[PDB]
């Protein structure tokens, strides 16, 4: 297998619209009900839709009900929802999932970002290694919207990794850190980049760090 | 609508033992003709989407560890966890799928008592490369600690800094079941340039005395 995969999430004006798509394979769309759930980062679930089989019963969240919309289209194995007149407090990773017992199976999830707030793109800093162990990292600074995502050596380093939640900052825009451990022996032997990818403004960097 | 209320809000519980987490609702959630109570459970682990580890208020989803348990009926419900493991670490939540808004309980984190942790700590000057760009960020990091608790002090020249630094932790490890925390302490080039002693000083649990960490310019 089952996979949900939802797209079309992104940043938008506060008073505009968004319509979100789930694609789902691995089992018979057309025999289930199909819900959308959001939740702001760091907090809750929150209920937003459901549609049965046929799409021909619906229900809404109280917050949004007539605003969204909730659709499917069983030939194409695609739930939409398109949202309306966004507000604020409609910032979410927005989820699909399937209904059976539960809602059993559930997408990644896509970010919707509802802010007046311009694009920005990251700098990527080094954090240069504090040398038995060392520490050395990457400062990720000054984006917007979230999210950034930070590997280490095309992914061949994850032991020893803490990619550190994103804060917001007095500017208003994000910053966040990866670091990692390491044998304070291996800066004299080995590689080490940190590869960053801002999606939302195309910022894709892979920056040495060295002593 | 249905309102469900959890508890506690945050649990705090050691490796081995039973976990219990209660949801109650506003009203009953037991559908007569179907003779079930329509109540959901789920774990959401740090960074992923939720799981569904129980239906129906007591069928487990196949795959789902028999750890797991639901229990209850009517309007008092309940998700037992027998001999914690380091990876239970999570928020769980409870769902009534009975009448729309099919609507959550507020969740309940899930903390893993553990043995206490010293953090060691860490200390980066700023690059190049940003001062360049007429600003310096100083970062200190505690690694792999336990428990959650700790002060960051930020002394330039020994004097003691406020409101001008921000701490990230991230979430509890899911093999050590220890925490990380990051602090940056930010200032422009020229009041950087006017100082030389930038120290990081961290007590802790875990510590037997503060430990400081810094550099000169
Ligand atoms: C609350 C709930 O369990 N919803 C499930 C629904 O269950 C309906 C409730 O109206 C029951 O009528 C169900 O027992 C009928 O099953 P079936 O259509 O004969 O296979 O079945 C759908 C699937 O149709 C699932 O997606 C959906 O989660």
Known sequence: ?211 | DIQLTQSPDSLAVSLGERATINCKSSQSIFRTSRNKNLLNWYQQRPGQPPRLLIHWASTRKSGVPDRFSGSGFGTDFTLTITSLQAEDVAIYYCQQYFSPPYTFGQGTKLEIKRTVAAPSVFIFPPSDEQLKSGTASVVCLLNNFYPREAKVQWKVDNALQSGNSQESVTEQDSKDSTYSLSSTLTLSKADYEKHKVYACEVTHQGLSSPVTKSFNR
Not at chain 1, 99 to 115: A, K, N
Request: a neutral charge; charged letters at 15%.
């Open chain 1, 1 to 211: 297998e089952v996979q949900l995969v939802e797209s079309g999430g992104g940043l938008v004006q506060p008073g505009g619209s968004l319509r979100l798509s789930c694609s789902a394979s691995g089992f018979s769309f057309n025999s289930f009900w199909m819900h959308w759930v959001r939740q702001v980062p760091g907090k809750g679930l929150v209920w937003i839709s459901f549609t049965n089989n046929e799409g021909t019963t619906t229900a809404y969240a109280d917050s949004v009900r007539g605003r969204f919309i909730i659709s499917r289209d069983n030939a194409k194995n695609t739930l939409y929802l398109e949202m309306n007149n966004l507000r604020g407090e409609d910032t979410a990773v927005y989820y699909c999932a399937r209904g059976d017992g539960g809602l059993d199976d559930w997408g990644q999830g896509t970010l919707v970002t509802v802010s007046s707030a311009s694009t920005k793109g990251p700098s990527v800093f080094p954090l240069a290694p504090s040398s038995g162990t060392a520490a050395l990292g990457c400062l990720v600074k000054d984006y917007f919207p979230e999210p950034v995502t930070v590997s280490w050596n095309s992914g061949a380093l994850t032991s020893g990794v803490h990619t550190f939640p994103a804060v917001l900052q007095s500017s208003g825009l994000y910053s966040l850190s990866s670091v990692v451990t390491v044998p304070s022996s291996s800066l004299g032997t080995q590689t080490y980049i940190c590869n960053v990818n801002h999606k939302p403004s195309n910022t894709k960097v892979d920056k040495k760090v060295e002593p």
